[PDB]
Design a protein around this ligand. Sequence first.
Ligand SMILES: *[C@@H]1O[C@H](CO)[C@@H](O[C@@H]2O[C@H](CO)[C@@H](O)[C@H](O)[C@H]2NC(C)=O)[C@H](O)[C@H]1NC(C)=O
Lengths: 194, 224, 214
Amino acid sequence: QPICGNGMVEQGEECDCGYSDQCKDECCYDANQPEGKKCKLKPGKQCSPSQGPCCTAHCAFKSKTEKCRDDSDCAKEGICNGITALCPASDPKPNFTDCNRHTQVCINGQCAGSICEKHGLEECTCASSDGKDDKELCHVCCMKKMEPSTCASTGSVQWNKYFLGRTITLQPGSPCNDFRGYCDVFMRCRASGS
Amino acid sequence: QVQLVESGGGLVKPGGSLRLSCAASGFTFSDYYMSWIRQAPGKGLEWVSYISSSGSTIYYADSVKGRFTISRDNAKNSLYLQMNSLRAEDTAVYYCARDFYDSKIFDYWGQGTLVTVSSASTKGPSVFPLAPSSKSTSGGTAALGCLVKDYFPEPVTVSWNSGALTSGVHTFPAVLQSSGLYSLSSVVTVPSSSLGTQTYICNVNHKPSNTKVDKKVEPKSCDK
Amino acid sequence: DIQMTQSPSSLSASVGDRVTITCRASQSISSYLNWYQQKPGKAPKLLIYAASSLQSGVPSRFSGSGSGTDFTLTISSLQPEDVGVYYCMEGLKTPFTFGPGTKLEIKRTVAAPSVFIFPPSDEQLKSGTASVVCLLNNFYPREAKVQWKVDNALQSGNSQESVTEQDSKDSTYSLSSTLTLSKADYEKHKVYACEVTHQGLSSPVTKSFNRGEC
Ligand SMILES: *[C@@H]1O[C@H](CO)[C@@H](O[C@@H]2O[C@H](CO)[C@@H](O)[C@H](O)[C@H]2NC(C)=O)[C@H](O)[C@H]1NC(C)=O
């Protein structure tokens, strides 16, 4: 149901300033207008703010080299294309950059995997015999490629050359304990109810 | 079953300290995390502390850190929550809970215990009966009650007929009389025949003054 | 800083009405959110552990839902025992935050308030004061009006009205005021009464007693 009038702009239409009582945007016809001009872009206008962040309030495309998307952990600042009212695709930050509070790396211009593969390793799940075995679940561990027996914590004599006494802690929302749990803010693996 | 009993809590002067204990009757007390959550008299619930099974993990809230010292004894199946430097905003009912193997967050709770940070002094509750109608009708039209006059901290318990009388019993927290005095009245409506058949008595326990009063309610019975 | 909003806060509906409560989150809180029910005097109780999961022993009419920043509790058929205050508490991105609290009353047909008048006790009279109590029981709605016409003189104010909560068993209310006076005030007037003006009473039915109290 792609209803015209919703604040979001869907296909078919091009601007959704809304109903007349709230359509402050002059670039767009009101949603309660005749169907010939049903949420259509006003004549002699270049863009509307509802189309994207690269439009001026005076219905003109924001010039090129104008910022539209902020810098992220794996994304550089987006500049307006000067030809479209939407922020174009941001150029990705370089591979393996420290991401997700240094728990992960910048892969494919996004934040996935873990820091283990930054050092040429792969991530793994540790396990303790007795005591506070929960804490280890929220502690990042790494393994050699296809060698599960090499699994060890980041902050250990093993992987010391890579992490140098850094017991990296998982971020809240990251799964743990072989997906059985999800790590919480208190650094306690938690989930899989019952 | 699961049953948690909380003891302590009362009238503490501003500042100072107080001790609170939670007793966990039936469950594997050494296999579950423990926690404390409190609610002010007229506000919402608010978490306080979260305790691991064998120590090694003791969190608090940013509003209580430096004031609350919590402890536990798995052998004794108890959960202590010592609190220091109490302010006026600590007047609340504190609830004991069990923060399960981090799942079904708090599967069970306790009834709590009120904490009053007022600078006043505890006063013994006078008990006065509210008599029924001596010109009794029949068919079930009657009512009787007890008045707990001048009782303070807050908490009072009323058990009509030593727990036998439960249906028709009504009780609601009182309001300050002129010179800072709570005065609660409990009321129950009973059949007119039972008014002349059984004996009806209110059992009131004022834990803070440690005064227990058992007052029976009988009709006026003038011209003795 | 995660912000927990709960809409609505106050809510009155009749038996069998479908009820929806929304817990609004400032950011993308995790699905480890549980809904709890509290009744006054007693302690809260678990209703729905994580997103759309019914706890054993909880009535099976409840049904959770929601993702991202919006979570929803759905009571399929409201019932007299569902009166209470409901809270939403999230997890895993949560220092155990509790929602503001959705209060929920019930709507029922108007019932006749049972009015009883209680003269004071003799022991209190020797102390120096006296307390006369008027009682209203098992009525709806909260609408009330109590007048103390001592010796037909409509003096008012030493009464302090206490209003109970809705009994889940029968969805009714209760109320009580307390007139307080001194010894000389007790002999100051002759005949005491309390007047009731509930809307379900076609007339202001008043219960009265002489000072002889017998
Ligand atoms: C740079 O980033 C690209 C985009 O993610 C990488 O390409 C993939 O990286 C993953 C990382 O584990 C590999 O599993 C895939 O085999 C790669 N190729 C494809 C087609 O997905 C790339 O490896 C990164 N590194 C370099 C040096 O380019």
